């Protein structure tokens, strides 16, 4: 009865991802980054996520991951900012960078 296998939106409970889907980009699933407004994020990389809504068209500006363009990923239920979807790159072509403290971990 594993208690730590699925990630939900911390604000509303929307199903978002799974521990099984964690992706070591450059050899770690966890990347600590800051944006141009100086906000620091603990980003967890996932191969796959669901329950999101991707807004706008991709941008390469200020991308933390070489060769990838990003789109903002909201919770599709509550509209909370959960992270970004990355695309346009290589091996893999796409992935999700989700903000760890915006997710709640728990049983399947
Ligand atoms: O890889 C990424 C994802 C998007 C992220 N991003 C933000 O967090 C942001 C906030 C305000 C202005 C501009 C940005 C921007 O590029 C960022 O800086 N890099
Ligand atoms: Zn939500």
Does residue 94 have its Cβ closer than 6 Å to ligand 1? no
Distance of CA 18 to the CA centre of its chain: 11
- Rounded Cα gap, residues 68 and 64, in angstroms: 8
- CA–CA separation, 104 and 28 (whole Å): 20
Q: For residues 56 and 24, what is the distance between their CA atoms, to the nearest angstrom?
A: 26
The DSSP symbol for 4 reads S
What token pair was written down for 67?
């060769």
Resolution (A): 1.7
Solved with: X-ray
Ligand 1 pocket test, pick from 25, 43, 60, 62 with the greatest ligand atom count within 8 Å of Cβ, gives 62
> What distance in Å separates the CA atoms of residue 108 and residue 99, rounded to the nearest whole number?
20
The closest alpha carbon to 24, from 54, 65, 85, 58, belongs to 65
| 34 burial type by CB count under 10 A (0-12 exposed, 13-18 middle, 19+ buried) | exposed
Decide: helix, strand or coil at residue 100.
helix
- The span from the first CA to the last CA of the chain, in angstroms, equals 8
CA dihedral 51, 23, 97, 108 (to 10 degrees): 30
């Amino acid at each position: 009865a594993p208690g730590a296998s699925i990630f939900r939106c911390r604000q509303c409970g929307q199903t978002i991802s799974r521990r099984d889907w964690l992706l070591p980009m450059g050899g770690d699933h966890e990347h600590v980054v800051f944006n141009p407004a100086g906000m620091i994020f603990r980003v967890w990389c996932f191969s796959l996520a669901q329950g999101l809504r991707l807004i706008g068209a991709p941008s390469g500006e200020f991308s933390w991951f070489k060769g990838y363009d990003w789109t903002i990923a909201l919770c599709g239920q509550c509209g909370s900012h959960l992270g970004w979807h990355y695309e346009g790159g290589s091996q893999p072509q796409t992935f999700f960078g989700l903000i760890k403290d915006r997710l709640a971990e728990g049983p399947a």
